[PDB]
Amino acid sequence: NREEKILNREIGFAIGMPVCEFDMVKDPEVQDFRRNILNVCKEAVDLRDLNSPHSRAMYVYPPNVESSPELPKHIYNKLDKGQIIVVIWVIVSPNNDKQKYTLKINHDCVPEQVIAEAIRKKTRSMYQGKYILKVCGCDEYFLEKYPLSQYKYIRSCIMLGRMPNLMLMAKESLYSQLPMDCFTMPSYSRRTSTKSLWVINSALRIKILCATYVNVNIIDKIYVRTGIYHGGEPLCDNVNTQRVPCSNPRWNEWLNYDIYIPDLPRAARLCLSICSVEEHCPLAWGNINLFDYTDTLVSGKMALNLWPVPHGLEDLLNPIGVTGSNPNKETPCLELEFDWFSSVVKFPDMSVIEEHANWSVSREAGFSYSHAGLSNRLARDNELRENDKEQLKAISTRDPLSEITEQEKDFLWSHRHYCVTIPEILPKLLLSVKWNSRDEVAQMYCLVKDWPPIKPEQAMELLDCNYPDPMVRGFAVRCLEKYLTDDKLSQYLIQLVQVLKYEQYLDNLLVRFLLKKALTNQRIGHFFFWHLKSEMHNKTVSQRFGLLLESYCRACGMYLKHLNRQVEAMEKLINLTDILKQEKKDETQKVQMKFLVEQMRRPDFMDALQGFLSPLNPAHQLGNLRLEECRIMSSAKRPLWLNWENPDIMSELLFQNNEIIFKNGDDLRQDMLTLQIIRIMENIWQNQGLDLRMLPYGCLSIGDCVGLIEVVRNSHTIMQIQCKFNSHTLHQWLKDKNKGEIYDAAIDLFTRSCAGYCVATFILGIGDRHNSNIMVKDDGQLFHIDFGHFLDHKKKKRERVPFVLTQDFLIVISKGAQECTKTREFERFQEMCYKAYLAIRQHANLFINLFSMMLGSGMPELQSFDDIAYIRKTLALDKTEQEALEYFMKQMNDAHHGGW
Ligand SMILES: CC(C)[C@@H]1COC(=O)N1c1cn2c(n1)-c1ccc(N3CCC[C@H]3C(N)=O)cc1OCC2
């Protein structure tokens, strides 16, 4: 047991709460999750010891590869006849003397071939399966047989015109360093009648007894508002209790609902709230799953602790809110009573559902012309015309925020069998289902059961708040299991972690998929841990995320120990910054720095703040902290500028110092999402041969309004440039930094990165640009920082241009010409914008879905589908492609007072 106790201390330190608190949770769902999730843990551990040591090395150091080995024409043209120059370093003599070997090989060469060529060059100077290639300066390895150019490091080197520097390491040098972890099963591994829902011939009714902890200001009259929901879709009309004074919240009233108990869908929920009053106002709210995790209908007495109303929610009910009782018991508590049927009621099995769907399909197949004429949801098989097929195809092209009329819904449902031939229509077909009809739902189940697979980015939509059904969500997860690459999983990890909150139960297919991937890929596992840990202060998700983190920490292996180093380093940094903002806030920079350096030099702190992996990128080792290079930044919330040595043997070939900005006080979640979207945008542009280089620098939220920002070396704000001022200062600075022949490359890089940031900021509705949030690298790469604001943040009770190209920017674009607006350079720059704008337009659904998946997150500027609709306005989705280009030009023309 000594091993178990110690490991529980390690897991508790990682999660930020003791494991014993989980053991005390009475709720059977919680204890069943803890026990049953362990098979995902076992499965993942089995996959890792399948082909050991190689399979273990693949888990710890997965290949950091692109999704496809194909190169866009513009990237291939950067290669000398499809060949790349590569530098291979062999550490040999004592005191680690470095021998370099320059190779000109095909871009498609496998690491083993690269090693053979290196051995050839070293032998000419006077086995291949005994070495591995490592990226110089960081812990990135090439353990798998992918073409060299498919490795992200290599592709980046090709794209940026950089020399790839790789190090020949012995297989045994790496293998001996990966410890053998023996995953142990925890102590908790060792643990009337029953009627079907469809045999309950009764209407729904729920009793509202009384409310406790209704502490309000003498508010002069209150009631309970209730409704039956399927996602955010009401299943019947809302039912309110009679009004009562808040001084005595007693109702003892059965509420009768307009729904037959057998018609209740699987994901049906009771959404309620205590309202005051005419200006009706919600005081507290709470949601409940009408069926528990065991598929049992709610029976008996239940007490539900309510949640405080979130600012901006005028609506009396909160359906897209969290389901379950508030963990804090010193909150308004509502007592409810459910119906009793003298037996346990369960949701029918798939076999019963299938028998019923086949019975319905067969019955409908025999319907006469006139019977089918009774309903617009009924359509005879052979009546399917080509015009109808064309209408179905047109509907499937519409964006997820485009309204589907009641007529289109009846249309889609009656043609559901033809819909299988155009499988991407599934999200529209599902919103057209009468979720309060068991006859229709049973048939939808069977259609989904055998539904053709759709793209992972299309399936992701089916995991958002509009799709609560577990059969639907199960199909989505299966598409991800079959077609989502680890690369794309990493890219969309924030969205996939968010959509976990929309799950009715702790144990589901999505969490099993995500956990298995985190436990079989340490790069995925790293960010999985941090995304969950960053939200552990949020009581809406702390039990879910806490239980998930416990399962992750039991099976991740040795990485727990490394994570605990990063957790301890962040904890010390939160502690220091918290003191500086509450105890030393008014003191000078010189004084504050003296306190900081004295605190940091304490042996306990000094050890905790050095020799750990960067949470921004775990391939980066943070060695000794360079205190003399550290500083308190004069910016808002006084962030810490931190500098560590990169202890890697060949750090000089990557970077010798790792500089990170630690910030305590601002919410960094909107920045992370924007930075992710900028990268996705750049990826779309690059694939279409549209070379607009963006700078989606690293940003990670590690807690409540705490996080890390990746520093971009040799980059300066426009204000830093002009504060050496004329409009020619910037262009003169770039000319000075790019003297000679290389000048044109800087102007091209500037105009290209400028076009990208113009289009990206206009689409996304980012916070207003100024000379302190626009940065420029010495080579001419323009980029933006501080993405705290996006979408419709300047809304009133209509669209903006956040990046207005002042004379300074146009002078650079036009190479110093006076009439910068009327030059061929500016005409070429406009063309880059138009193409960039239209390309994003073609991928609008992806962007709409990425934002829709982030709705359950507590982001201030992303609270409703109305906020996402801003992107539907900027992309001009209701207009044609030419009208959309015209609208963009007009927005640009108005903001710049001419030119477009
Ligand atoms: C104060 C800080 C938190 C700001 C505000 O919100 C951001 O997003 N910020 C940010 C991002 N980046 C940098 N600031 C940054 C700052 C300075 C430097 N540089 C590098 C050279 C010296 C220093 C400078 N220009 O002062 C480089 C940076 O990288 C881009 C990411």
* Nearest residue by C-alpha to atom 24 in ligand 1: 716
Q: Can you read off the two tokens belonging to residue 496?
A: 């996939």
Q: Provide the CA 830 distance to its chain's centre, in angstroms.
A: 32
* Nearest residue by C-alpha to atom 11 in ligand 1: 785
Tell me the CA–centroid distance for residue 261 and ligand 1, in Å.
59
Decide if 661 contacts 640 (C-beta within 8 A): yes
Tell me the CA–centroid distance for residue 683 and ligand 1, in Å.
24
Tell me the CA–centroid distance for residue 711 and ligand 1, in Å.
6
Instruction: Show which of 307, 326, 346 is a domain's final residue.
Output: 346
Asked if residue 319 and residue 428 are part of one domain, the reply reads no
Rounded distance between C-alpha atoms, residue 636 and residue 785, angstroms? 14
Cα Rg, the chain, nearest whole Å: 30
* Nearest residue by C-alpha to atom 13 in ligand 1: 711
User: Could you identify the atom of ligand 1 that is nearest to the CA of residue 775?
Assistant: 30
Asked if residue 810 and residue 740 are part of one domain, the reply reads yes
Asked if residue 256 and residue 321 are part of one domain, the reply reads yes
Asked if residue 369 and residue 304 are part of one domain, the reply reads no
Asked if residue 798 and residue 674 are part of one domain, the reply reads no
Tell me the CA–centroid distance for residue 644 and ligand 1, in Å.
17
Solving technique: X-ray
In a domain, 127, yes or no: no
Resolution in Å equals 2.5
Tell me the CA–centroid distance for residue 774 and ligand 1, in Å.
10
Enumerate residues preceding breaks in the chain (C to N > 2.5 Å): 126, 191, 218, 277, 724, 797
Asked if residue 329 and residue 247 are part of one domain, the reply reads yes
Structural domain boundaries, residue 357: 350-558
In a domain, 152, yes or no: no
Rounded (5°) CA angle 646-647-649? 110
Residue reference for tokens 């992918």: 146
From the CB of residue 676, how many other CB atoms can be counted at a distance below 10 Å?
19
Decide if 372 contacts 840 (C-beta within 8 A): no
* Nearest residue by C-alpha to atom 6 in ligand 1: 786
Rounded distance between C-alpha atoms, residue 606 and residue 480, angstroms? 43
In a domain, 496, yes or no: yes
Residue of 635, 712, 720, 769 with the most ligand 1 atoms within 8 Å of its CB, for mutation = 712
Rounded distance between C-alpha atoms, residue 354 and residue 351, angstroms? 5
| Residue 628 to residues 595, 604, 641, 662, 832, Cα–Cα distance (Å) | 14, 19, 11, 16, 44
From the CB of residue 279, how many other CB atoms can be counted at a distance below 10 Å?
5
Q: Can you read off the two tokens belonging to residue 301?
A: 């007495």
Residue of 629, 673, 715 with the most ligand 1 atoms within 8 Å of its CB, for mutation = 715
In a domain, 313, yes or no: yes
Asked if residue 459 and residue 380 are part of one domain, the reply reads yes
Q: Can you read off the two tokens belonging to residue 764?
A: 């996304």
User: Could you identify the atom of ligand 1 that is nearest to the CA of residue 636?
Assistant: 1
Tell me the CA–centroid distance for residue 635 and ligand 1, in Å.
10
Ligand 1 pocket by C-beta < 6 Å: which residues? 633, 635, 639, 661, 663, 697, 709, 711-713, 715-716, 720, 775, 785-786
Tell me the CA–centroid distance for residue 765 and ligand 1, in Å.
21
Asked if residue 566 and residue 541 are part of one domain, the reply reads no
Longest dimension (CA), the chain: 96
Q: Which long-range contacts (CB under 8 A, 24 or more apart) does 327-330 make?
A: 327/539, 327/542, 327/543, 328/539, 329/305, 330/213
Instruction: Show which of 500, 527, 558 is a domain's final residue.
Output: 558
Question: Exposure of 113 by Cβ count < 10 A (0-12 exposed, 13-18 middle, 19+ buried)?
Answer: middle
| Residue 76 to residues 632, 749, 773, Cα–Cα distance (Å) | 44, 19, 34
Sign for the CA dihedral angle at 73, 78, 80, 83 comes to negative
In a domain, 6, yes or no: no
DSSP character at residue 94: T
Query: Before 262, cis peptide (omega within 30)?
Result: no
DSSP character at residue 300: S
Rounded distance between C-alpha atoms, residue 213 and residue 30, angstroms? 26
* Nearest residue by C-alpha to atom 7 in ligand 1: 786
| Residue 603 to residues 71, 85, 496, 591, 843, Cα–Cα distance (Å) | 51, 46, 40, 21, 53
In a domain, 71, yes or no: no
User: Could you identify the atom of ligand 1 that is nearest to the CA of residue 635?
Assistant: 1
Alpha helices in 317-405 (DSSP H): 350-365, 369-372, 386-397
* Nearest residue by C-alpha to atom 16 in ligand 1: 711
Task: Count the domains in the chain.
Answer: 4
DSSP character at residue 209: E
Asked if residue 576 and residue 510 are part of one domain, the reply reads no
In a domain, 126, yes or no: no
Type and span of the H or E element at 91? strand 83-91
Instruction: Show which of 346, 381, 396 is a domain's final residue.
Output: 346
Q: Find residue 106's DSSP bridge partners.
A: 83
From the CB of residue 701, how many other CB atoms can be counted at a distance below 10 Å?
22
In a domain, 328, yes or no: yes
Tell me the CA–centroid distance for residue 863 and ligand 1, in Å.
29
Query: Before 696, cis peptide (omega within 30)?
Result: no
Asked if residue 365 and residue 305 are part of one domain, the reply reads no
Asked if residue 673 and residue 563 are part of one domain, the reply reads yes
Asked if residue 494 and residue 533 are part of one domain, the reply reads yes
Question: Exposure of 407 by Cβ count < 10 A (0-12 exposed, 13-18 middle, 19+ buried)?
Answer: exposed
Q: Can you read off the two tokens belonging to residue 151?
A: 């490795």
Tell me the CA–centroid distance for residue 775 and ligand 1, in Å.
8
Q: Residue 688 carries which side chain, given as an amino acid letter?
A: Q
Rounded distance between C-alpha atoms, residue 874 and residue 799, angstroms? 7
User: Could you identify the atom of ligand 1 that is nearest to the CA of residue 695?
Assistant: 30
Q: Are strands 239-240 and 222-230 parallel, antiparallel or unpaired?
A: antiparallel
